Design a protein around this nucleic acid. Structure first.
Ligand code: ZN
Ligand code: ZN
Ligand code: ZN
Ligand code: ZN
Ligand code: ZN
Ligand code: ZN
Length: 179
DNA sequence: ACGGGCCTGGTTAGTACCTGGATGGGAGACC
DNA sequence: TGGTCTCCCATCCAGGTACTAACCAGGCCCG
């Protein structure tokens, strides 16, 4: 079963490895059986391994990498990095993928991919929807701003005439008053 | 020659959304 | 059964995203 058990009353914890209890104990006490070896740092631990994992940080090492094809960006921990992959490469979730090869990426939504793909072009994604113009954009919000132009009641009198039309009442005049 | 709008390329706060980075707590493979 | 040195996860929290709404100032256009 679980021999080792908390020494304090009420806790009730119990472990099948003295060390497990031993780390739990330090919770009650507040010991630093494994402190760091550098000033400014007062970080403590309860395992000769929870100190090491902290070491690579006092420097900024990246001994672990993202087990994936395309991305080389290494990570600080394995099980940790495992996150990235699943949040990027591993399909099932990020089904839609840019198979343009080399770029090798993916997205949760189809449209999301479509956009990206444009990065392999010369044009921008979110472009102005209307005849003529053709003006394209990146940030949709910015496009929505330009839209304010093609929105009114332009008359039809050959390319010659090409004024828009704020509103019917004002649009009519353009025809009557002018034309 | 002008002044006020209408836009627009260039920027800049204002944010809800994520993402690693760093841990806390322990199973576990072996011996 | 218990050490030892490993290998995972489920999270918590600060730095960085991906855009959006709000500013700014110069180019045109027209009464
Ligand atoms: Zn306890
Ligand atoms: Zn330290
Ligand atoms: Zn990757
Ligand atoms: Zn791509
Ligand atoms: Zn347009
Ligand atoms: Zn007209």
């Amino acid at each position: 079963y679980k021999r080792y058990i908390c020494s304090f009353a009420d806790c009730g914890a119990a472990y099948n490895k003295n060390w497990k209890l031993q780390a739990h104990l330090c919770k009650h006490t507040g010991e630093k059986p494994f402190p760091c070896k550098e000033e400014g740092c007062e970080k403590g631990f309860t395992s000769l391994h929870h100190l090491t994992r902290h070491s690579l940080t006092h420097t900024g090492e990246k001994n672990f990498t993202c087990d994936s094809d395309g991305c080389d960006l290494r990570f600080t921990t394995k099980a940790n990095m495992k996150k990235h992959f699943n949040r990027f490469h591993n399909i099932k979730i990020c089904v839609y993928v840019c198979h343009f090869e080399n770029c090798g990426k993916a997205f949760k939504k189809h449209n999301q991919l479509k956009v990206h793909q444009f990065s392999h072009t010369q044009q921008l994604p979110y472009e102005c929807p209307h005849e003529g113009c053709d003006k394209r954009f990146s940030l949709p919000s910015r496009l929505k701003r330009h839209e304010k132009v093609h929105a009114g009641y332009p008359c039809k009198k050959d390319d010659s005439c090409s004024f828009v039309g704020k509103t019917w009442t004002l649009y009519l005049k353009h025809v009557a008053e002018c034309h």
